[PDB]
Design a protein around this ligand. Structure first.
Ligand code: QH4
Ligand code: GDP
Ligand code: MG
Length: 169
């Protein structure tokens, strides 16, 4: 069976855990201990291909032990998550991109930019700014709400298709 290692990164609070549990469990968690880092496997069919998605929901502390690099480097593709109501989390996207490039030691890693909390009225990051940045990184941009499940399947499945494109090259 085909397996894909997906890693979800982005500032504390953006909804990495909420997105992952929506994908895994089909519902929304209002609280998920912000320190709990774990990976969840889910069998899915995407464009007719059965696969195991192994999803690393990143949390814990900001630290850069060799052990940390070693597990993050197992990621085949990464969701770069910010929250549309949080300007700082959008600023942080550069950091997560660079860290991916560092540990994968490559400039061609499957990534999807994810603009989460789409359900909220308090928007501070324009869709245009997000599309401009994804455009400049050469990667897709998906708007999501972990609360309503908008764009959740799309974010993950698009990342899979990005990994596929990469494996074709
Ligand atoms: C709310 C808790 C949570 O979701 N966290 C805690 C922080 N942590 C993390 N933060 C971080 O940067 C924090 C901000 C952004 C720029 C300025 N700082 C203050 N950077 C990282 C992490 C987790 C460890 N990773 C990391 C380490 C080694 C290799 C990596 C490769 C690719 C991506 C990340 C790597 C850097 C984790 C989590 C936030 C998330 N994601
Ligand atoms: N309204 C709304 N709230 C969200 C969404 N995603 C996450 N949250 C809330 O934001 C908080 C942080 O989410 P969490 O998944 O813990 O963030 P993480 O730190 O990136 O794992 C929690 O109270 C969630 O319920 C979303 O799409 N919409
Ligand atoms: Mg979390």
């Amino acid at each position: 069976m085909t397996e894909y290692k997906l890693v979800v990164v982005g500032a504390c609070g953006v909804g990495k855990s909420a997105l992952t549990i929506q994908l895994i469990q089909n519902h929304f968690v209002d609280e998920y201990d912000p320190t709990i880092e774990d990976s969840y496997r889910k069998q899915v069919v995407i464009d007719g291909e059965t696969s195991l998605l192994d999803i690393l929901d990143t949390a814990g502390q900001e630290e850069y032990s060799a052990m940390r690099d070693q597990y993050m480097r197992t990621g085949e593709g990464f969701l770069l998550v910010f929250a549309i109501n949080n300007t700082k989390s959008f600023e942080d996207i550069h950091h997560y991109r660079e860290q991916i490039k560092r540990v994968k030691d490559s400039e061609d890693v499957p990534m999807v930019l994810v603009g989460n909390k789409s359900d909220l009225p308090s928007r501070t990051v324009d869709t245009k700014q997000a599309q401009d940045l994804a455009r400049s990184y050469g990667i897709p941009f998906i708007e999501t709400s972990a609360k309503t499940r908008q764009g959740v399947d799309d974010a993950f499945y698009t990342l899979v298709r990005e990994i596929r494109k990469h494996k074709e090259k």
